[PDB]
Amino acid sequence: SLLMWITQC
Amino acid sequence: MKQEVTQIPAALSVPEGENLVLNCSFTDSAIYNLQWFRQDPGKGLTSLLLIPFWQREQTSGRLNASLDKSSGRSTLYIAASQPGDSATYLCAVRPTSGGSYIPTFGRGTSLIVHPYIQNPDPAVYQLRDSKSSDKSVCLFTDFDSQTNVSQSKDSDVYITDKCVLDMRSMDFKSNSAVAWSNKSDFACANAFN
Amino acid sequence: GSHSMRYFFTSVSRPGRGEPRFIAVGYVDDTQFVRFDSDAASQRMEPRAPWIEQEGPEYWDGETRKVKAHSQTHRVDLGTLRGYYNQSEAGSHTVQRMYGCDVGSDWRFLRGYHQYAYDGKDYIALKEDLRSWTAADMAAQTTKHKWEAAHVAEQLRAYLEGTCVEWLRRYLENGKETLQRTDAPKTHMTHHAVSDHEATLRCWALSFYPAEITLTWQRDGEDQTQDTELVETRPAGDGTFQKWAAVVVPSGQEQRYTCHVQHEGLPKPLTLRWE
Amino acid sequence: MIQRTPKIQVYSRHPAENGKSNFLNCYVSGFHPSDIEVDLLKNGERIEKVEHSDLSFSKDWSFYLLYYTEFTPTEKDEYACRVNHVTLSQPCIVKWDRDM
Amino acid sequence: NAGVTQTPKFQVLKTGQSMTLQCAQDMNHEYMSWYRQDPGMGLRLIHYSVSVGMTDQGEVPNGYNVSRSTTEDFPLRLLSAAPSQTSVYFCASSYVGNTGELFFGEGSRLTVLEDLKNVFPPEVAVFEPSEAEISHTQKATLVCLATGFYPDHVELSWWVNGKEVHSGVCTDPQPLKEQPALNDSRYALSSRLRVSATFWQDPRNHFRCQVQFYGLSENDEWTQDRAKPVTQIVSAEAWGRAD
Ligand code: NA
Numbered sequence: 001s002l003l004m005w006i007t008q009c
Numbered sequence: 010m011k012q013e014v015t016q017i018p019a020a021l022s023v024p025e026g027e028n029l030v031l032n033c034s035f036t037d038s039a040i041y042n043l044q045w046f047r048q049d050p051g052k053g054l055t056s057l058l059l060i061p062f063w064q065r066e067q068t069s070g071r072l073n074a075s076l077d078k079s080s081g082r083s084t085l086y087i088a089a090s091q092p093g094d095s096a097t098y099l100c101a102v103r104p105t106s107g108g109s110y111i112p113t114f115g116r117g118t119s120l121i122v123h124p125y126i127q128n129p130d131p132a133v134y135q136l137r138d139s140k141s142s143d144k145s146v147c148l149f150t151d152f153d154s155q156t157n158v159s160q161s162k163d164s165d166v167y168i169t170d171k172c173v174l175d176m177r178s179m180d181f182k183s184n185s186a187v188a189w190s191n192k193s194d195f196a197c198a199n200a201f202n
Numbered sequence: 203g204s205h206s207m208r209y210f211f212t213s214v215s216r217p218g219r220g221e222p223r224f225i226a227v228g229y230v231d232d233t234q235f236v237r238f239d240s241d242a243a244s245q246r247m248e249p250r251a252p253w254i255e256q257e258g259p260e261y262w263d264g265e266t267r268k269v270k271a272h273s274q275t276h277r278v279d280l281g282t283l284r285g286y287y288n289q290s291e292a293g294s295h296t297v298q299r300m301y302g303c304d305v306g307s308d309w310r311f312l313r314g315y316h317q318y319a320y321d322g323k324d325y326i327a328l329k330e331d332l333r334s335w336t337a338a339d340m341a342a343q344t345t346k347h348k349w350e351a352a353h354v355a356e357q358l359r360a361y362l363e364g365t366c367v368e369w370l371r372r373y374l375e376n377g378k379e380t381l382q383r384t385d386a387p388k389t390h391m392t393h394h395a396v397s398d399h400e401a402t403l404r405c406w407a408l409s410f411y412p413a414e415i416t417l418t419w420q421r422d423g424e425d426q427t428q429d430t431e432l433v434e435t436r437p438a439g440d441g442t443f444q445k446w447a448a449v450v451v452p453s454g455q456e457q458r459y460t461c462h463v464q465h466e467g468l469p470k471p472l473t474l475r476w477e
Numbered sequence: 478m479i480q481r482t483p484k485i486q487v488y489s490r491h492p493a494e495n496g497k498s499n500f501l502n503c504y505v506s507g508f509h510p511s512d513i514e515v516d517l518l519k520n521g522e523r524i525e526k527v528e529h530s531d532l533s534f535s536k537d538w539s540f541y542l543l544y545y546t547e548f549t550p551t552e553k554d555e556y557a558c559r560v561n562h563v564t565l566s567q568p569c570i571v572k573w574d575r576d577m
Numbered sequence: 578n579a580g581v582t583q584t585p586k587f588q589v590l591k592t593g594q595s596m597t598l599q600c601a602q603d604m605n606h607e608y609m610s611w612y613r614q615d616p617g618m619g620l621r622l623i624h625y626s627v628s629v630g631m632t633d634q635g636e637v638p639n640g641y642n643v644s645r646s647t648t649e650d651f652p653l654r655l656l657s658a659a660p661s662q663t664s665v666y667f668c669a670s671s672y673v674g675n676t677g678e679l680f681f682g683e684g685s686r687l688t689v690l691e692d693l694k695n696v697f698p699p700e701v702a703v704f705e706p707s708e709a710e711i712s713h714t715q716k717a718t719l720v721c722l723a724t725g726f727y728p729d730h731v732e733l734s735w736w737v738n739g740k741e742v743h744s745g746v747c748t749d750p751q752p753l754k755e756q757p758a759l760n761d762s763r764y765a766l767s768s769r770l771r772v773s774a775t776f777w778q779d780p781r782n783h784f785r786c787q788v789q790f791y792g793l794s795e796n797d798e799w800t801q802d803r804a805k806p807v808t809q810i811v812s813a814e815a816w817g818r819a820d
Contacts, residue, residue: 001261001369002209002228002268003301003361004108005041007354007674008605009279009318009326009345042677050750053667053684061676063356103677106365108267110608110627110673111635114620134707136720139815146704146720148769167753169767174747176716176771185747187720187767210533212540214511221629225532237531245630250531267627271673274607274628278648295478296510298538319538321478322509352675392576404576408492436504437530439490439545446577 010037014115016100022121024154025092031085031118033100041103043076043083048117049096057098058085062105090122092173092182123154124173124182131156135197147197150185158186161202166190168201203412203466204312205231205381207370208302213276215284215295222280224273230373230381232413233441238269245270253377283320286341295321301358303366309374314362332359385411385442386467391474393456402431404448405461405474409438416464417447426459481539482564483508487557487573493550501548501573503558506541515544516559518570523559524548550575579603583668583682587730587791587808589696590689596655598685600668606680607673609651610635611643613664620667626651627673658689686791688728693797695761696806698790699726703813706777717777719815721786724765725755730791735770738783745771782817 013036023029045057058067060076067074071088087094097119101112131152138144160168168188175182188200207230214223224240235251247265249255279297301316316328324338326345333355337346349355374381387410394402407415413435419426431448438444451459456476463472484507490500501517511532517524530543548556556573582601590596600609610625622635624643632643640662642654655662668682706717723731729752735742748768756762768786776782792806799805
């Protein structure tokens with residue numbers, strides 16, 4: 001199951 | 010766990026100058042963040058504080074909030090409450106699974122901070138239209154914050170809710186309510202009862 | 203044995219001629235189980251292994267939604283990186299991300315990872331402590347500062363140690379018939395007379411799973427590590443793998459050499475010698 | 478942007494036996510950027526029905542792909558893999574050697 | 578920078594008309610959403626998006642359509658407006674990471690009517706301070722009364738000697754219904770501006786209550802004998818006086 005919260009570089 | 014956010018009490022009424030606390034509780038602790046907002050009738054929502062799951066608390070001026078993610082609750086604290094703090098405070102949470110990122114909002118807590126009227130001087134005045142005009146309105150003013158302004162029912166006779174105004178340059182504030190009627194046989198004497 | 207769950211993402215800008223390409227693939231050990239391709243007509247995260255097919259509608263909807271959110275984060279990232287490097291907007295660039303977790307034989311957490319690359323080179327990676335970052339260069343110091351301020355490592359650490367390990371276990375159990383299977387290699391050796399006085403001995407390992415395997419040659423009883431020709435393990439195309447190891451030996455002396463094969467499918471290591 | 482040229486391996490899925498249907502594979506790996514063109518040849522002519530795996534990459538970030546097609550090996554038919562990539566100035570042809 | 582920008586802020590529609598509410602954000606947010614909030618009621622999600630080319634339904638998707646062909650914009654389309662759609666709409670966006678902080682646009686108030694003859698602009702009047710208040714308190718309260726408007730789309734402001742003022746002013750949080758027995762009752766709104774008696778007594782001071790009304794546009798059909806109730810400013814004034 002994928003990561004939900006992801007942060008821009 | 011289908012997320013459900015609760016805010017009790019739903020209504021809160023305090024005298025200005027007092028510190029106060031608003032509660033927020035949620036059924037599912039698996040949240041990404043919790044955010045507190047503020048909304049006045051007829052207006053939009055203003056974000057007050059945002060607490061990510063990695064922080065335990067935040068501060069912004071006279072406002073501070075804590076987050077107890079494990080016990081499913083957050084508390085918003087307001088110091089030296091001012092009449093301007095009056096509004097509906099909303100608490101929302103974001104989820105950590107599902108890919109929707111949809112926030113769950115609580116119903117909100119309605120806060121009314123009553124001004125401190127140091128020298129009450131209640132009185133009903135009659136004001137004339139500058140246009141001419143046979144028209145007039147009644148003004149009930151300078152009453153303390155314990156006074157209740159209801160509308161002694163009588164269609165054709167209108168009565169507004171109490172309103173607070175601040176004369177900031179003179180460190181003065183007062184409550185007022187307005188009444189008017191289209192009928193001739195209407196008097197300020199028997200306007201507010 | 204040990205196991206891992208890993209997601210791989212490739213983002214490529216195609217300036218002037220289309221939106222960026224976004225491809226995501228997921229693996230449990232050496233078995234791919236899901237894929238997403240922005241160019242496919244579907245626009246759905248798709249199954250690639252039999253056992254994941256037991257997941258219901260909610261799962262597929264949720265994974266499809268999260269992979270599109272990843273695509274958008276990458277869409278933004280392409281432009282951000284182009285700016286950091288003061289690069290033209292006519293060229294095509296590539297961003298790659300990989301994250302996942304490893305568990306031991308007991309299915310307990312061993313380690314986590316989250317790595318990011320720009321134009322085929324390390325850009326920023328999460329250290330094994332799952333707390334700090336290694337920024338490959340100066341532009342990456344900018345991303346590093348934003349990730350420290352936003353506490354991205356704590357966000358990742360929660361997923362890697364929790365969600366990632368929990369789902370890996372669910373999958374291992376749901377797909378045990380194949381994921382926890384071990385196809386022992388089928389071995390044989392060939393001989394090719396290359397030039398006068400010499401011959402090549404090639405040792406083969408075919409149809410094995412998982413891909414990890416150790417092929418070694420010894421002369422008499424000594425390892426010939428530095429003198430062995432070893433090809434990259436390759437897929438057969440049916441879910442199994444192939445690999446060979448070769449050594450150049452003097453003609454008439456091929457029986458002094460032994461090929462040793464170690465693999466999880468074999469009760470004990472195999473020794474091969476030329477007939 | 479340093480680019481990496483593809484490593485190429487041409488082989489069969491199952492051990493090759495003349496007259497017996499099998500699958501011809503061309504495994505391209507260790508390349509960057511991802512755009513690549515791969516053809517399977519039969520006596521120098523491109524084979525029409527060829528499929529491939531989903532794009533993935535290795536630890537060092539280089540990409541890998543498996544191109545495959547059904548084929549029937551014979552003693553004299555020549556099979557090969559043709560590859561074009563930005564790092565190549567000419568297409569690269571690697572012949573199938575059933576012994577490798 | 579600009580934050581979330583929604584437009585238009587006010588809008589009246591006749592049943593069956595099409596309408597697009599715009600929502601833009603310049604923060605590269607991945608998540609964008611639309612909410613409707615009825616007066617005194619909660620926020621209900623209509624549609625949302627997490628990426629260009631992706632849209633999904635919220636709790637009340639019926640009657641609305643969305644699209645996300647660009648990172649910055651998430652327009653809400655009403656194909657055929659119904660009276661049930663009269664509400665306050667808010668667009669909200671956030672990153673799908675970082676702190677996940679949500680940003681709300683300023684809101685859009687839409688009123689859908691079966692017939693536009695129910696739309697009325699406000700009449701405005703300013704009432705002068707009582708001489709009794711002046712001698713009793715040394716203060717002077719002016720009262721502004723906006724009456725007979727519909728829909729409740731007004732913004733009341735006080736101008737003193739050509740400048741807008743906020744000190745000594747308090748306006749009703751919500752208007753009152755002139756005919757509470759009716760669903761399409763026109764409204765009234767009051768406001769007070771309190772100054773010192775000496776400021777009111779100065780004949781050089783000019784007081785003006787203005788009410789910006791948002792109604793019909795120049796491109797709306799009007800079959801009534803009265804003037805078309807278009808978006809306009811209606812005001813009343815009074816000058817200070819020594820007597
Ligand atoms: Na994150």
